[PDB]
Amino acid sequence: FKGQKMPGRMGGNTVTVQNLEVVQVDTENKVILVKGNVPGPKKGLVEIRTSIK
Amino acid sequence: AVPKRRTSKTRKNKRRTHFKISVPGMTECPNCGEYKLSHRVCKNCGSYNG
Amino acid sequence: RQTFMANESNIERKWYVIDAEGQTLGRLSSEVASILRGKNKVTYTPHVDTGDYVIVINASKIEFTGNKETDKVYYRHSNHPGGIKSITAGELRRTNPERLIENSIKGMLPSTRLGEKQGKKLFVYGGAEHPHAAQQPENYELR
Amino acid sequence: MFAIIETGGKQIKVEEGQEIFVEKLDVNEGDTFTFDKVLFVGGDSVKVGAPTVEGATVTATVNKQGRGKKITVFTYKRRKNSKRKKGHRQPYTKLTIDKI
Amino acid sequence: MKVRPSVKPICEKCKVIKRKGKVMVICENPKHKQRQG
RNA sequence: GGGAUAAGUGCUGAAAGCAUCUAAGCAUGAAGCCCCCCUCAAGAUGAGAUUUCCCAACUGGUUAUAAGAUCCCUCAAAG
RNA sequence: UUGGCACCUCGAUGUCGGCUCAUCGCAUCCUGGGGCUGUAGUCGGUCCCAAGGGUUGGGCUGUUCGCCCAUUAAAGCGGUA
RNA sequence: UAACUUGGGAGUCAGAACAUGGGUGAUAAGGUCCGUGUUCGAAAGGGAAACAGCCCAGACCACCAGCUAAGGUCCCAAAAUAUAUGUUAAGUGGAAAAGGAUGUGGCGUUGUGACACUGCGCCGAAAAUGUACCGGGGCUAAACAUAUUACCGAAGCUGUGGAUUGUCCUUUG
Which residue type, as a one-letter code, is found at position C87?
I
Beta pairing class for D48-49 and E15-19: unpaired
Does residue D21 sit at the C interface (CB-CB below 8 Å)? yes
Per the structure, the complete domain to which residue C15 belongs is given by: 1-143
Distance D74 CA to H10 C1' (A): 30
Residue D65 contacts residue D37 (beta carbons within 8 Å): no
Distance of A39 CA from H24 C1′ (whole Å): 79
Distance from CA of D77 to the nearest CA of C (A): 32
DSSP letter for C102, please: H
Question: Distances from the Cα of C6 to the Cαs of A27, B26, C39, C41, in angstroms?
Answer: 77, 58, 13, 11
User: Smallest Cα–Cα separation from A44: which of A18, A11, A10?
Assistant: A11
Resolved by = cryo-EM
Cα dist. B41→A29, B24, B34, B48 in Å?
Answer: 49, 14, 12, 5
Quick one: closest CA in C to A3, which residue?
A: C80
**Nucleic strand F contact set for B 16-35 (CB, < 7 Å):** 22-23, 25
Q: Distance between CA D65 and CA D38 in Å, rounded?
A: 23
- D91 beta partners: D67
Domain count, chain C: 1
Rounded-to-integer distance, Cα D19 and Cα D33, Å? 13
D59-67 vs D91-99, strand pairing mode: antiparallel
Which nucleotide is the nearest neighbour of D68, by CA and C1'? Answer: H62
A11: nearest nucleotide, CA–C1' criterion:
F78
- Do C and A share at least 3 CB pairs under 8 Å? yes
D70 CA from G13 C1′ (Å): 52
- Euclidean distance between CA atoms E24 and E3, whole angstroms: 9
Give me the number of domains chain D comprises: 1
Contact between C11 and C41 under an 8 Å Cβ cutoff? The reply is no
**Resolution of the coordinates, Å:** 3.1
- Is C110 near strand H, with its CB below 7 A from some atom of it? yes
Contacts with C79 from chain A: Cβ below 8 Å: 2
CB A23 within 8 A of CB A35: yes
What range defines the domain where residue D84 resides?
1-100
Calculate the alpha carbon distances from D31 to A31, D34, D96, D98 in Å.
Answer: 110, 10, 11, 12
For helices C97-106 and C25-37, what crossing angle results, to 10°? 60
- Residue closest to B28 by CA, chosen among B12, B16, B45: B45
Q: Convert C83-122 to b/e letters by CB count within 10 Å (16 or more is b).
A: eeeebebeebbeeebbebbbebbbebbeeeeeeeebbebb
Strand G contact residues in chain C (79-108), C-beta within 7 Å? 81-82
Q: How far apart are CA D11 and CA B18, in angstroms?
A: 61
Distance CA C48, CA C6 (A): 7
The reply to whether E11 sits in an annotated binding site is yes
**Dihedral-angle region of residue D45 (phi above 0 means left; psi in -120 to 50 means alpha; beta otherwise):** alpha
